[PDB]
Ligand binder design. Structure first.
Ligand SMILES: *O[C@H]1O[C@H](CO)[C@@H](O)[C@H](O)[C@@H]1O
Ligand SMILES: *O[C@H]1O[C@H](CO)[C@@H](O)[C@H](O)[C@@H]1O
Length: 36
């Protein structure tokens, strides 16, 4: 999983695709998505 405020889904993204065990993968823009 990702950390808090980290990335979980973007066009230029390769890190953890799931958000922190206390954070949620909420999409931002069609090129960026982060963990809250
Ligand atoms: O995925 C989330 O939890 C993991 C541990 O269970 C961490 O490795 C990760 O970075 C996230 O916080
Ligand atoms: O979650 C923490 O680690 C991530 C990298 O795996 C970062 O993107 C994030 O901002 C935190 O530093």
């Amino acid at each position: 999983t990702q950390s808090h405020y980290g990335q979980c889904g973007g066009i230029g993204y390769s890190g953890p695709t799931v958000c922190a065990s206390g954070t949620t993968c909420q999409v931002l823009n069609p090129y960026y998505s982060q963990c809250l």
